[PDB]
């Protein structure tokens, strides 16, 4: 019937976590004044900020 | 000295720095003494209302 | 002495209770569960809200499952306390549940009232009235927001939450009819209330958000939900009469394994009026005095437990020509049936006959499959309407087989049946296992 | 004919219900259980009992496990019927539970009232009222014994019975704070009642005595009990006004997996007053007559279901900057939330928001873990206090968004949260898994 | 929204949702022995 | 307990340190790890008629002067430790 | 009580009955001296 | 508790070590200024550890 | 009023009693209150009504 592809809930690709998320980033990188890590490795931080998927077959 | 100083930013004041760790190792006292337990037939008795002879 | 004196008192008759023990009571094993959260989301109402108007809303695919639905209505009083009776219930004339274009179920304002009369109770019932009426002696001009919970199968238990996530191709919609008139709000008996406001309406749906593993399974796997459906038809009541005992045989166009039947007689003029009116306290406008009128109810007290004002003398159900059970009195169906099977208190004029041990529950517990019945008939015998409603001596001192002369106004009959079907969900679409 | 006519009515459609049957309704299965006995034993209360005093007791080791605890009080009416409202509940200002020196939990007189308002019901609630108040139109000088059951996690089910037997090295103590004053007993509003008696007090603990096998099992094994805790802070309610709708963002100092939040607004002077006073029937002392005065409640009728006298217009809970749900009216939190989640009736001025499917049970059913939330904010909007409370027409005939001028007296706000934690009992000692 | 609660998962929740055993959103009802109930009048012996 | 001096009425102290008056750290509360450090204050009832010395001098613990309502400002202080790092001719603080 | 188990219990009346039957002579008198005022003490007198 | 009474306390195991101990008392003057001398000190007749 | 105790462990943290190392022994304080306190319940030899 009504070709509705996705559920209308933000859980698509929104990061609705707390600010502890930033602390989690400090876990994958150096855990100190790490500001130079995102100030320089924008590519590494972007790849570290991608979403996951789980396909559904009809 | 002017830019590499660590500031008390967000993430360091999270509640999980206290709630995730239990207060059991900071308040409990070491025992190393076994606990007792006894049968119910030892404190109550033997119930003398059994047979007669 | 003390508790040890009971423990020591042990012998052969204790073995059947505590020998070779299987359980304890002093440590509960709790079961770890999945990760989920619940959120209330406003739906958009298409159409136009107003009395007599129809509206509809699509339940948005906001959550990976839906349960509770509450419809808000804002109404004002068109008169003083005593003029309204569950007006938000009267207002929600009906609601249709549709999935993928096909009706799954449909409820009527009268069903909500009938259902309530039989299945809600105690503080659950009182709190329930507080959400649909004015119960603190409010006066004309008062404004209140009412909350009408829906009672579709998924609105009663998480166990049947509808997997919107598994319905990638089907929308689920709610269609609503708002009554042309609501007593004590925009009309008083048959009279319109000048200046009455139109309702403000909003539909709220409580959504369940699942975590990754649970959501994935719901999205991919086929499901079979055991669901409830309401069957309903309106009939004319063999009009009760002062001169005799009316009788009637109503063939029931029902199918499916039915949990129970329920019915009521009513005066369609006044929402919720299932009994006759009389000059006794609460039984009519002005009851108890010279000015009492037994043709207009005390709306705030429209319902009653005084069976003397009800019209059913007796009834039975016949299946394929044979009596299902021996004929029983109307009070059996009003008081005993729900005593034995529900445990609540049912207002006079409302009747129940269960085929189920526990008709109020989700789990099947005995059903009557009307699909194997060629001729399903409800047989009714009415009371004689010989009692002068304006005279308490006659109203209250009378016999089992008679009722009020005003009971002849209870000309409508509403017969309901609740049955079990299966809602199949797969490949993004829902469907019913059984048509009939 | 008869029931046989239904059994024969069997088709393909009945297979999902009765084909290849799994169960039978006509045969009940009970399980054999351990052998145990229950005894109610009086505890010794340390400190002097009286108004405003703080007293305590250590639970004795008479049995192996404990559940129910009932505090007995004897109070004497300081005036006639209608001057008191749940006075034994008001008297017990609070109770702390400490095991081995660690605070496990705490309940407050207001909490007992809020808890009751949300979770007790029907005749459970009435019988409760009978144990804490005078409900048969008693007169001055009447003396009654009141019973206040406690509401700690082990006081609700044997399932969480506290294993005193496995707490071999730890004492369990209860600290009870008695109110400085109880309305209609030792004070009438702010005025002391001459001749008022001090309360008699006694604490009773219901003990479970185990048999040989279970008693041994408990003493020798470590145990972990999933229990509830109450979090609570008091705060000022942005005072509403006749001309503006006060608003307030309240930061919630809560942690752990919370089943629900609960709150109320109140007049701190009048125990149990969660709504404004008014000249409508029972909403003020003297309501309905010339003497009606909207400065004092009809205490025996302090509560009401008339939301018109409640202060809250609307509310939402915002978590980490995002609405946790759409803003709803105060009446939602008063009537629908408990309709859906509890099934009882909540009086006006008391609100509930559940994060759980069934918060009234013991089995967790969805929680909000505030230890993973940085900004937990309760956002409240209040009604305008423009209604002349001394005129029932003004009250009874008003609009959704307005309330009594006397609603500005509801300046206290009590916000509660009920959550889970784990009580670990090991090597004879008790304590909590999560700080 | 509700999603902000789901991601708020911690150590404290291991006893509630870790290694999950049950759900609340899939009730499977039991199939049961077919039966019918009839109310039948008895004969009472004696005045 | 913590200083050994005598503090004027209206001035309050709460130490997290054994000896806060000294230089050597002797216990501290690190508020950089506390989300909600809240100071809860309950005030006395200003029922005493300040113009009548008997009213003041003979009164109870929970009350004060009617003139006490003039004390409308609240000043809250905290004293902490930090590190002033000095290197290669320059200085600055280790923590902000 | 020993270990939570009641072993025994005495009552004021028992002490009186017990004494009446089993104490005697000067033991009984000395007992009375330790529990009563037997030297014509007057109002306001204090005794351990 | 009151004048002439003997009371006692058992220190609970709330923490690990104990140091300073303060006994609080609430007293009311039975006469005017100049009629007392360190009365809370006088009140606590003795303390045994 | 506040009456700090003057036992050795109440004077220096250096002598803090290790309740933690006293697992099977209790620490108790027995306090005797005076029958009379000057200017509070007695004035010289007279009681204060």
From Swiss-Prot, chain A:
Record's note on what induces expression: Expressed in the late phase of the viral replicative cycle.
Protein localization: Virion
Transmembrane segments: none
Subunit structure: Interacts with the major capsid protein.
Role noted for this protein: One of the minor capsid proteins that constitute a network internal to the major capsid proteins and outside the lipid membrane. The minor capsid proteins glue and stabilize the capsomers.
Protein name listed in UniProt: Minor capsid protein P4
Organism from which the protein derives: Paramecium bursaria Chlorella virus 1 (PBCV-1)
Gene from which this protein is expressed: A572R
Portion of the full sequence shown: 5 to 62 of 181
Curated annotation (Swiss-Prot), chain B:
GO cellular-component term (any): viral capsid
Induction comment: Expressed in the late phase of the viral replicative cycle.
Subcellular location: Virion
Keywords: Capsid protein, Late protein, Virion
Main location class: virion
Keyword S-adenosyl-L-methionine found: no
Coiled-coil regions, chain positions: none
Superkingdom to which the source organism belongs: Viruses
Described function: One of the minor capsid proteins that constitute a network internal to the major capsid proteins and outside the lipid membrane. The minor capsid proteins glue and stabilize the capsomers.
Subunit structure: Interacts with the major capsid protein.
Protein name: Minor capsid protein 3
From Swiss-Prot, chain E:
Bridged cysteine pairs (disulfide): none
Range of residues in the leader sequence: none
Transmembrane segments: none
Record note on modification: Myristoylated at the C-terminus. Glycosylated; highly branched oligosaccharides. The pattern of glycosylation sites are unusual.
Induction: Expressed in the late phase of the viral replicative cycle.
Subcellular location field: Virion
Domain of life: Viruses
Reported function: Major capsid protein self-assembles to form an icosahedral capsid with a pseudo T=169 symmetry, about 190 nm in diameter, and consisting of 1680 major capsid proteins trimers. The capsid consists in 5040 copies of the major capsid protein (hexamers), 60 copies of the penton protein (pentamers) and 1800 minor capsid proteins of different types. The minor capsid proteins form a hexagonal network below the outer capsid shell, stabilizing the capsid by binding neighboring capsomers together.
Other remarks in the entry: The viral capsid possesses up to five major capsid protein variants. They behave as asymmetric capsid components.
Family statement: Belongs to the NCLDV major capsid protein family.
Protein name: Major capsid protein
Protein species of origin: Paramecium bursaria Chlorella virus 1
Lineage of source species: Viruses, Varidnaviria, Bamfordvirae, Nucleocytoviricota, Megaviricetes
Full-sequence range covered: 3 to 49 of 437
UniProtKB/Swiss-Prot annotation, chain G:
Coiled coil: none
Post-translational note: Myristoylated at the C-terminus. Glycosylated; highly branched oligosaccharides. The pattern of glycosylation sites are unusual.
Subcellular location: Virion
Induction summary: Expressed in the late phase of the viral replicative cycle.
Taxonomy, superkingdom: Viruses
Family: Belongs to the NCLDV major capsid protein family.
Function as written in the Swiss-Prot or TrEMBL entry: Major capsid protein self-assembles to form an icosahedral capsid with a pseudo T=169 symmetry, about 190 nm in diameter, and consisting of 1680 major capsid proteins trimers. The capsid consists in 5040 copies of the major capsid protein (hexamers), 60 copies of the penton protein (pentamers) and 1800 minor capsid proteins of different types. The minor capsid proteins form a hexagonal network below the outer capsid shell, stabilizing the capsid by binding neighboring capsomers together.
Further comment: The viral capsid possesses up to five major capsid protein variants. They behave as asymmetric capsid components.
Name the UniProt record assigns to this protein: Major capsid protein
Native species: Paramecium bursaria Chlorella virus 1
Full-protein positions shown: 99 to 146 of 437
């Amino acid at each position: 019937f009504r070709d509705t592809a996705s559920i209308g809930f933000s859980d698509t690709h929104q990061d609705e976590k707390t600010l502890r998320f930033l602390k989690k980033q400090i876990s994958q990188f150096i855990k100190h004044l790490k500001e130079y890590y995102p100030n320089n490795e924008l590519t590494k931080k972007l790849v570290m900020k991608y979403s996951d998927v789980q396909l559904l077959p009809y | 000295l002017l830019r590499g100083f660590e500031s008390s930013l967000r993430g360091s004041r999270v509640r999980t720095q206290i709630d995730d760790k239990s207060f059991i190792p900071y308040t409990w006292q070491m025992i190393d003494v076994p606990l007792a337990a006894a049968k119910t037939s030892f404190i109550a008795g033997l119930d003398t209302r059994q047979q007669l002879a | 002495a003390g508790g040890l004196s009971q423990l020591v008192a042990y012998g052969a008759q204790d073995v059947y209770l505590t020998g070779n023990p299987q359980i304890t009571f002093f440590k509960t094993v709790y079961r770890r569960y999945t990760n989920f959260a619940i959120e209330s989301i406003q739906q958009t109402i298409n159409g136009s809200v107003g009395f007599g108007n129809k509206v509809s809303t699509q339940i948005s695919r906001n959550g990976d499952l839906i349960t509770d639905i509450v419809v808000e209505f804002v109404l004002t009083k068109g008169g003083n306390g005593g003029t309204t009776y569950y007006p938000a219930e009267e207002l929600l004339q009906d609601v249709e549940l549709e999935i993928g274009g096909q009706r799954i179920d449909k409820h009527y304002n009268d069903w909500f009232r009938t259902y309530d009369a039989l299945f809600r109770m105690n503080d659950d019932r009182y709190n329930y009235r507080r959400m649909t009426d004015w119960v603190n002696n409010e006066l004309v001009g008062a404004q209140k927001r009412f909350y009408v919970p829906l009672i579709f199968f998924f609105n009663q238990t998480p166990g049947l939450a509808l997997p919107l996530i598994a319905l990638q191709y089907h929308e689920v919609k709610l269609y609503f009819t708002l009554a042309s008139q609501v007593q004590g709000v925009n009309y008083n008996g048959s009279s319109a209330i000048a200046g009455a406001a139109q309702p403000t309406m909003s539909v709220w749906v409580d959504y369940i958000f699942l975590d990754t593993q649970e959501r994935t399974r719901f999205a991919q796997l086929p499901h079979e939900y055991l669901i409830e459906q309401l069957q309903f038809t309106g009939s004319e009541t063999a009009t009760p009469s002062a001169t005799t005992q009316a009788s009637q045989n109503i063939r029931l166009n029902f199918n499916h394994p039915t949990k129970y039947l329920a019915w009521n007689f009513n005066n369609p003029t006044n929402y919720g009026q299932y009994t006759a009116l009389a000059n006794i306290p609460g039984a009519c406008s002005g009851a108890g005095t010279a000015a009492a009128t037994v043709t207009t109810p005390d709306y705030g007290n429209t319902g009653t437990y005084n069976e003397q004002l009800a019209v059913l003398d007796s009834a039975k159900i016949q299946l394929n020509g044979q009596d299902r059970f021996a004929t029983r009195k109307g009070s059996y169906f009003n008081k005993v049936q729900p005593y034995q099977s529900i445990g609540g208190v049912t207002p006079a004029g409302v009747y129940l006959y269960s085929f189920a041990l526990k008709p109020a529950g989700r789990q099947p517990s005995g059903t009557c499959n009307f699909s194997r019945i060629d001729n399903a008939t409800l047989s009714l015998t009415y009371k004689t309407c010989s009692i002068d409603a304006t005279s308490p001596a006659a109203v209250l001192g009378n016999t089992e087989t008679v009722t009020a002369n005003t009971a002849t106004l209870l000309t409508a009959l509403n017969i309901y049946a609740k049955n079990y079907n299966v809602l199949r969900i797969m490949s993004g679409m829902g469907g019913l296992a059984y048509a009939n």
